[PDB]
Amino acid sequence: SVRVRGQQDNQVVGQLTITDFVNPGGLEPIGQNLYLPTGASGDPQEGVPGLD
Amino acid sequence: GENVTLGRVALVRVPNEQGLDKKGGTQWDSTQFSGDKIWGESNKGSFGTINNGMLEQSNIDMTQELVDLISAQRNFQANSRSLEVHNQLQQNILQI
Amino acid sequence: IPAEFGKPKQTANIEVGVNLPANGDLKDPTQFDFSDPDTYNRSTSSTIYDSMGQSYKLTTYYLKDQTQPNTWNTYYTVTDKEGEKPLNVAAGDAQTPTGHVGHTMKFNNDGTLASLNNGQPITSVALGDPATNTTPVDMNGADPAQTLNFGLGSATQFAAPFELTKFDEDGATTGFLTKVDFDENGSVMGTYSN
Amino acid sequence: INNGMLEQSNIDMTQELVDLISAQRNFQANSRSLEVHNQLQQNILQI
Amino acid sequence: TLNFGLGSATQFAAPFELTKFDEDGATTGFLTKVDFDENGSVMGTYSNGENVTLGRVALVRVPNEQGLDKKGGTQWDSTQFSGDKIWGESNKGSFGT
Amino acid sequence: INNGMLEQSNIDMTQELVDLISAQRNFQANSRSLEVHNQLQQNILQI
Amino acid sequence: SYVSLSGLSAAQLDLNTTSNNIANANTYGFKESRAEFADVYSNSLFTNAKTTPGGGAQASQVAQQFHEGSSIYTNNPMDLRVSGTGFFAVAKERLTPQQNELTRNGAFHLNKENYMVTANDEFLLGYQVDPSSGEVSSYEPQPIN
Amino acid sequence: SYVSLSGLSAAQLDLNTTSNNIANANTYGFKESRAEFADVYSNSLFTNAKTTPGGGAQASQVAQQFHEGSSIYTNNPMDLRVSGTGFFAVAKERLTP
Amino acid sequence: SYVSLSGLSAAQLDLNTTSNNIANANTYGFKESRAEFADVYSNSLFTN
Amino acid sequence: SYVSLSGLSAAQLDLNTTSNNIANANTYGFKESRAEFADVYSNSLFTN
Instruction: Evaluate whether D32 touches H90 at the Cβ level (below 8 Å).
Output: no
Mutate to test the interface with D, among F21, F26, F30, F34 (most CBs of D within 10 A): F21
Instruction: Evaluate whether C137 touches C78 at the Cβ level (below 8 Å).
Output: yes
Q: Does the beta carbon of H85 lie under 8 angstroms from any beta carbon of chain D? A: no
Residues in G closer than 8 angstroms to I46, CB to CB, are 65-68
CB contact (8 A) between residue F29 and residue D45: yes
CA distance J39 to chain G (A): 22
Instruction: Evaluate whether A1 touches A13 at the Cβ level (below 8 Å).
Output: yes
Q: How many residues can be counted in chain B?
A: 96
CA distance H60 to chain B (A): 8
Chain B residues within 8 Å of chain A (Cβ atoms): 30-32, 36
Q: Is the dihedral of CA C111, C117, C121, C123 positive or negative?
A: negative
Q: What subunits make at least 3 CB pairs under 8 angstroms with H? A: B, D, E, F, G, J
| Closest among A4, C143, C42 to B32, alpha carbons compared | A4
C-alpha span between C180 and I8 (Å, rounded): 34
| Closest among G85, D9, C22 to J2, alpha carbons compared | D9
| Pairing mode, strands G123-128 and G35-39 | unpaired
Instruction: Evaluate whether G125 touches G142 at the Cβ level (below 8 Å).
Output: yes
Instruction: Evaluate whether B23 touches G138 at the Cβ level (below 8 Å).
Output: no
Instruction: Evaluate whether C193 touches C5 at the Cβ level (below 8 Å).
Output: no
Contact residues for J3 (Cβ-Cβ < 8 A; gap 6+): H70, I16, I19, I20, I23
Burial readout I8-43 (b: 16 or more C-beta within 10 A, e: otherwise): ebeeeeeeeeebbbebbeeeeeeeeeeeeeeeeebe
Mutate to test the interface with C, among B13, B43, B46, B47 (most CBs of C within 10 A): B46
Q: Least CA distance to F25: which residue of chain H?
A: H1
Instruction: Evaluate whether H57 touches H40 at the Cβ level (below 8 Å).
Output: yes
Q: Least CA distance to H58: which residue of chain B?
A: B25
Q: Least CA distance to C1: which residue of chain B?
A: B15
> Residue A38: what residue type?
T
C-alpha span between I9 and G73 (Å, rounded): 9
H84 burial (CB, 10 Å; 0-12 / 13-18 / 19+) is exposed
| B residues 34-93 lying closer than 8 A (beta carbon) to H | none
Instruction: Evaluate whether H14 touches H6 at the Cβ level (below 8 Å).
Output: no
Residues in B closer than 8 angstroms to A2, CB to CB, are none
C-alpha span between B23 and B47 (Å, rounded): 23
| Pairing mode, strands C149-151 and C13-19 | parallel
Rounded to 5°, angle at Cα C14 from C10 and C20: 155
C-alpha span between G131 and B73 (Å, rounded): 60
CA distance D4 to chain G (A): 28
> Residue G14: what residue type?
D
C-alpha span between H37 and H59 (Å, rounded): 5
G near B: at least 3 beta-carbon pairs less than 8 Å apart: yes
Residues in B closer than 8 angstroms to D29, CB to CB, are 62, 65-66
CA distance I23 to chain C (A): 43
Q: Does the beta carbon of H33 lie under 8 angstroms from any beta carbon of chain D? A: no
Instruction: Evaluate whether C8 touches C142 at the Cβ level (below 8 Å).
Output: no
Instruction: Evaluate whether G126 touches B7 at the Cβ level (below 8 Å).
Output: yes
Beta bridge partners of G57: G39
Q: How many residues can be counted in chain I?
A: 48
Instruction: Evaluate whether C93 touches C104 at the Cβ level (below 8 Å).
Output: yes
Q: What are phi and psi of H26, to 5 degrees?
A: -110, -10
Compute the 3-state secondary structure of chain E and give helix, strand, coil in percent, each to the nearest 5.
0, 25, 75
| Closest among C95, C106, C42, C39 to C70, alpha carbons compared | C106
Instruction: Evaluate whether G16 touches B74 at the Cβ level (below 8 Å).
Output: no
CB contact (8 A) between residue F25 and residue D38: yes
- Which of the 8 DSSP states describes residue H26? S
Residues in H closer than 8 angstroms to E19, CB to CB, are none
Instruction: Evaluate whether A13 touches A2 at the Cβ level (below 8 Å).
Output: yes
Q: Taking each helix axis from N to C terminus, what angle separates D13-44 and H2-23, rounded to the nearest 10 degrees?
A: 160
- DSSP labels, D27-39: HHHHHHHHHHHHH
- Chain C to chain G Cβ contacts (< 8 Å): 3
Q: What are phi and psi of D6, to 5 degrees?
A: -135, 155
Q: What are phi and psi of G142, to 5 degrees?
A: -145, 155
Q: How far is CA C162 from CA C44, C57, D12, G58, H83, in A?
A: 10, 20, 48, 69, 41
Q: What are phi and psi of H60, to 5 degrees?
A: -90, -60
I near G: at least 3 beta-carbon pairs less than 8 Å apart: yes
How far out from the chain centre does Cα J48 lie?
29
Instruction: Evaluate whether G26 touches D26 at the Cβ level (below 8 Å).
Output: yes
Residues in G closer than 8 angstroms to C57, CB to CB, are 135
Neighbours of B29 (CB within 10 A): 16
- Which of the 8 DSSP states describes residue I45? S
- Chain D to chain G Cβ contacts (< 8 Å): 18
- DSSP labels, E39-70: T-EEEEE-TTS--EEEEE--EEE-S-STT-EE
Q: Does the beta carbon of G117 lie under 8 angstroms from any beta carbon of chain B? A: no
Burial readout C37-55 (b: 16 or more C-beta within 10 A, e: otherwise): eebbbbbeebebbbbebbe
Q: Which helix (H) or strand (E) holds B11?
A: strand B11-13
Chain I residues within 8 Å of chain C (Cβ atoms): 43, 45, 48
Q: Which helix (H) or strand (E) holds E76?
A: strand E75-77
Resolution in A: 3.2
Method of determination used here: cryo-EM
Q: How many residues can be counted in chain A?
A: 52
| Closest among G83, G94, G104 to G125, alpha carbons compared | G94
SS3 label, residue C180: strand
Beta bridge partners of G37: G59
Q: Least CA distance to B38: which residue of chain C?
A: C3
| Closest among G138, G136, G143 to G99, alpha carbons compared | G143
Instruction: Evaluate whether H56 touches H7 at the Cβ level (below 8 Å).
Output: yes
CA distance D23 to chain G (A): 9
Q: Can you give the C-alpha Rg of chain C in angstroms?
A: 20
C-alpha span between E54 and E43 (Å, rounded): 6
Q: How far is CA D6 from CA G46, G87, H68, J12, in A?
A: 89, 42, 12, 20
Q: Is the dihedral of CA B43, B49, B50, B52 positive or negative?
A: positive
Mutate to test the interface with H, among F12, F18, F19, F20 (most CBs of H within 10 A): F18
How far out from the chain centre does Cα H74 lie?
30
| B residues 17-36 lying closer than 8 A (beta carbon) to G | 17-18, 20, 22-23, 25-30
C-alpha span between G141 and B11 (Å, rounded): 10
Q: Taking each helix axis from N to C terminus, what angle separates B62-93 and G2-23, rounded to the nearest 10 degrees?
A: 160
CB contact (8 A) between residue D30 and residue H7: yes
Q: How many residues can be counted in chain E?
A: 97
SS3 label, residue I8: helix
Mutate to test the interface with D, among I3, I6, I9, I14 (most CBs of D within 10 A): I9
Q: Least CA distance to J44: which residue of chain H?
A: H84
Contact residues for G138 (Cβ-Cβ < 8 A; gap 6+): G127, G128
Q: Does the beta carbon of F18 lie under 8 angstroms from any beta carbon of chain D? A: yes
CA distance B33 to chain A (A): 9
Q: What are phi and psi of H55, to 5 degrees?
A: -110, 15
Q: Does the beta carbon of G35 lie under 8 angstroms from any beta carbon of chain B? A: no
> Residue G57: what residue type?
A
Q: What are phi and psi of H11, to 5 degrees?
A: -60, -40
User: CB-hemisphere CA count at 13 Å for H34?
Assistant: 20
F10 burial (CB, 10 Å; 0-12 / 13-18 / 19+) is exposed
- Which of the 8 DSSP states describes residue G25? T
Q: How far apart are the first and last CA of chain E?
A: 51
Breaks in chain G (C–N > 2.5 Å) following residue: none
Burial readout J3-41 (b: 16 or more C-beta within 10 A, e: otherwise): beebbeebeeeeeeeeeeeeeeeeeeeeeeeeeebeebe
> Residue A32: what residue type?
Q
Q: What subunits make at least 3 CB pairs under 8 angstroms with A? A: B
H helices of chain B, in order, are 62-93
Neighbours of D12 (CB within 10 A): 15
